[PDB]
Write a protein that binds this DNA or RNA. Structure first.
Length: 61
DNA sequence: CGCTAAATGGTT
DNA sequence: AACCATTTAGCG
């Protein structure tokens, strides 16, 4: 039992990256606001942010 | 294969 | 509950 891989829209990727350039971390309230704005789940936004921080560390190494 | 979403197991 | 480090795995 596995979740289908979300395919993010161009609009969703654009707004997640904008969120990340403004704030490396999100409060619970900012995370839930972002998910609602993008029509994603809280956990999909929490996962994108986590994986984005992993990417951020590798490309600043 | 590379990028990156989701899962695993640990940390805090 | 959320994050971290790493692994697993889907898709272009």
């Amino acid at each position: 039992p596995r979740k289908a891989r979300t395919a993010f829209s161009d609009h969703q990727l654009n707004q997640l990256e904008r969120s990340f350039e403004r704030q490396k971390y999100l409060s619970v309230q900012d995370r839930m606001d972002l998910a609602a704005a993008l029509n994603l789940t809280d956990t999909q936004v929490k996962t994108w942010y986590q994986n984005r921080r992993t990417k951020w560390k590798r490309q600043t190494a």
